[PDB]
Design a protein around this ligand. Structure first.
Ligand SMILES: CCCCCCCC/C=C/CCCCCCCC(=O)O
Ligand SMILES: CCCCCCCCCCCCCCCC(=O)O
Length: 160
């Protein structure tokens, strides 16, 4: 479920995408060949969030923004992907705002319906070991097997 009493304004700002788990081998593999720089969460004009990730793909920097539209309880969003012809729920299921957040995404419509992913965001680029465990704990509870849980390579290229 969503983080109780979720406060969007405290989730804003700079995060690092430190880990992910997913039932898509392809997505995990594609992501692990990228080197992650910052993600930034900024308010969207629709009352939701823009989630922008900066990353290195074949030694070249790229940025991608996902619009997370408000969907259910505070902390629950939906992301519509024209490229995948699918929509996906995205929820901040646990966070303490000042060190970590766990996001859980599931396909809700379209061929992406079966996709599931958990992401660990950390306010620091190397998460303390406590936070890795909070992530791997959650992934296990949600039925991700140990080889689908991966920690993502990081870089300081692509920023400033
Ligand atoms: C939460 C997973 C993303 C971790 C940040 C990595 C995103 C930056 C690069 C991703 C582009 C390549 C992956 C293609 C599908 C996107 C999946 C997604 O962004 O949720
Ligand atoms: C980067 C923020 C994470 C938020 C989650 C958004 C979901 C991403 C959409 C990409 C779809 C992945 C498709 C591979 C799954 C499959 O084909 O089975």
């Amino acid at each position: 479920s969503v983080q109780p009493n979720f406060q969007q304004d405290k989730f804003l700002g700079r995060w690092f995408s430190a880990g992910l788990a997913s039932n898509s081998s392809w997505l995990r593999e594609k992501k692990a060949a990228l080197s992650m720089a910052k993600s930034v969460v900024a308010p969207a004009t629709d009352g939701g969030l823009n989630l922008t990730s900066t990353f290195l793909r074949k030694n070249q920097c790229e940025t991608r923004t996902m619009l997370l539209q408000p969907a259910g309880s505070l902390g629950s969003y939906s992301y519509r992907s024209p490229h995948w012809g699918s929509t996906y729920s995205v929820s901040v299921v646990e966070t303490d705002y000042d060190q970590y957040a766990l996001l859980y995404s599931q396909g809700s419509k379209g061929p992406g319906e079966d996709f599931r992913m958990a992401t660990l965001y950390s306010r620091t680029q190397t998460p303390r070991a406590e936070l890795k465990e909070k992530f791997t704990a959650f992934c296990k509870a949600q039925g991700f097997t140990e080889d689908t849980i991966v920690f993502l390579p990081q870089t300081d290229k692509c920023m400033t």
